[PDB]
């Protein structure tokens, strides 16, 4: 909420949802979700911030590895 | 539970069993002792110092009988000794229940040595850290055998184990011959214990047992004090 201040933030945010789906982080990673969502918003070229920008920023800050995992559930 | 099921002792690239090599050093750090056979029976003598005056020397013992005619001592660590002592105590009984005869000392040494070699090859255990001296006058002639942590054995005329045995074997080489007596082996045994003993050799710094044609027995500090008396 603090580092999401100086950006074009549409009322699409649910900081309770974001902080609840993101445990085990610090202030650096929580700021990092804000800045990476800020870059992905420029990647799609939009001007304001939406919820899924933060949701993808979660994936980038988590920084997973891909190996073809679709064969579950 | 269950053990580990793998032996923790392999061959070196130099081809050496490193844990047995360390166990020999642990035997070499043990208390010194010696044993001599001479023409009527075997004399075993050890060196037993209490760490302080608070102990009871009459409680524990180094000289241990195995049967009517076999005694045994060691040069090494404490708790590993008593276990295989009790094992040998069993093995003489499993001989005697079959054959109704006291066991030949060599036949005892076969089974004890097989226990030690089986134990140093079996999975997930450290080997033993003692070496033994075994005495007995079976079929008239006395016998004197020495084991090792590796599980081999030998037929020594007279030898010494523990500390400074490399000096004690030279002293026994310059000391002993074929023709002696039991009390002579007592006197040179007190001499070779005095080669590396402490300043005072009282009746309880040592422990001496003997074999005869009458069989194995163990001395008391009265005549042991009379043996340290008129000695050196």
């Amino acid at each position: 909420q603090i580092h999401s201040r100086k950006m074009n933030v549409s009322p699409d945010v649910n900081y309770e949802e974001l902080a609840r789906c993101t445990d085990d982080f610090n202030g650096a990673q929580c700021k990092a979700v804000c800045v990476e969502a800020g870059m992905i918003a420029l990647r799609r070229g939009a001007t304001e911030l939406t919820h899924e920008d933060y949701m993808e920023g979660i994936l980038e800050v988590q920084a997973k590895k891909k190996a073809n995992l679709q064969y579950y559930a | 539970e269950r053990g580990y099921s793998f032996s923790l002792t392999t061959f070196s690239p130099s081809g050496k069993l490193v844990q047995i090599e360390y166990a020999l050093a642990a035997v070499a750090g043990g208390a010194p002792s010696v044993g001599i056979k001479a023409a009527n029976g075997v004399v075993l003598a050890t060196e037993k110092k209490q760490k302080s005056i608070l102990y009871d020397e009459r409680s524990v013992h180094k000289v241990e009988p195995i049967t009517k005619h076999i005694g045994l001592v060691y040069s090494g660590m404490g708790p590993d000794y008593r276990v295989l002592v009790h094992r040998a105590r069993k093995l003489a009984q499993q001989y005697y229940l079959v054959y109704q005869e006291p066991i030949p000392t060599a036949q005892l040494v076969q089974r004890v040595a097989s226990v030690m070699q089986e134990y140093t090859q079996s999975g997930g255990v450290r080997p033993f850290g003692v070496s033994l001296l075994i005495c007995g006058w079976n079929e008239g002639r006395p016998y004197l055998f020495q084991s090792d942590p590796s599980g081999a054995y030998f037929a020594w005329k007279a030898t010494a184990m523990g500390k400074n045995y490399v000096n004690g074997k030279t002293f026994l080489e310059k000391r002993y011959n074929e023709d002696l007596e039991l009390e002579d082996a007592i006197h040179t045994a007190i001499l070779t214990l005095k080669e590396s003993f402490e300043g005072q050799m009282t009746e309880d710094n040592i422990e001496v047992g003997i074999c005869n044609e009458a069989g194995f027995r163990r001395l008391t500090p009265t005549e042991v004090k009379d043996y340290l008396a008129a000695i050196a």
């Binding site: - | 269950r2 099921s5 793998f6 999975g123």
Partner: protein
């Protein structure tokens, strides 16, 4: 019970103990086998003896049944216990179904034993490969090989051991149909292979044949020198 997995998968999908065991086969002595239409023939090379010592015990060719002969390579110790279990199994076939054992069946037994032997716990895989030659019922002689993974695999001719790919190149570069015309011509092809292999000046080769109806027969080193003599003679006039 020593329960420990040994054969595990590599991070790129390989079985390290298997491919090391194939190297242990790959340093073994070279053995060559072909098949004829009426008489089969196979022989090992590189006896490497002291040239003054007995060797019936070092014979790396045995039989499982009357119609089943078998050679191998690799390390000698693991082979003969597989041979013994093969003898128990092929005998047990006759305790069951009355026919003699077909070579395809016995190779499925050996390879099928070998794979689950790699699948078990606390076991290094076998370090042998074997060539198994049998002339079955109705006179259809054939052969198979055995990878240490346990993949049975038929051939018209094959050669394993140390220095085997070049020998295989000699066999494809020399094998025809009219080379399998005469039996002694096929034996001349085998001696042309082991002579085309690694030295073995008579004293290291050990060939054994089967006429698809007899038992195995081993020639003494007189037809070795005779067939090598006519081989070097035919090469001499051919030169």
């Amino acid at each position: 019970s020593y329960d420990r997995a040994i054969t595990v998968f590599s991070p790129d999908g390989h079985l390290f103990q298997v491919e090391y065991a194939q190297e242990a086969v790959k340093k073994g002595s070279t053995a060559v086998g072909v098949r004829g239409r009426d008489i089969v023939v196979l022989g090992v090379e590189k006896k490497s003896v002291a040239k003054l010592q007995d060797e019936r015990t070092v014979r790396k060719i045995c039989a499982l049944d009357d119609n089943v002969c078998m050679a191998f390579a690799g390390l000698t110790a693991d082979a003969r216990i597989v041979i013994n279990r093969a003898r128990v199994e092929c005998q047990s076939h006759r305790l069951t179904v009355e026919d003699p054992v077909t070579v395809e069946y016995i190779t499925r037994y050996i390879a099928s034993l070998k794979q689950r032997y790699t699948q078990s716990n606390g076991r290094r895989p076998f370090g042998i490969s074997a060539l198994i030659v049998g002339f079955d019922f109705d006179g259809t002689p054939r052969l198979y090989q055995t990878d240490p993974s346990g993949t049975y695999h038929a051939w018209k001719a094959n050669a394993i051991g140390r220095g085997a790919k070049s020998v295989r190149e000699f066999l494809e570069k020399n094998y025809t149909d009219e080379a399998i015309e005469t039996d002694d011509l096929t034996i001349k092809l085998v001696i042309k292979a082991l002579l085309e292999v690694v030295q073995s000046g008579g004293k290291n080769i050990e060939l054994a044949v089967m006429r698809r109806d007899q038992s195995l027969k081993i020639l003494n080193p007189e037809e070795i020198e005779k067939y090598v003599a006519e081989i070097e003679k035919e090469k001499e006039e051919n030169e």
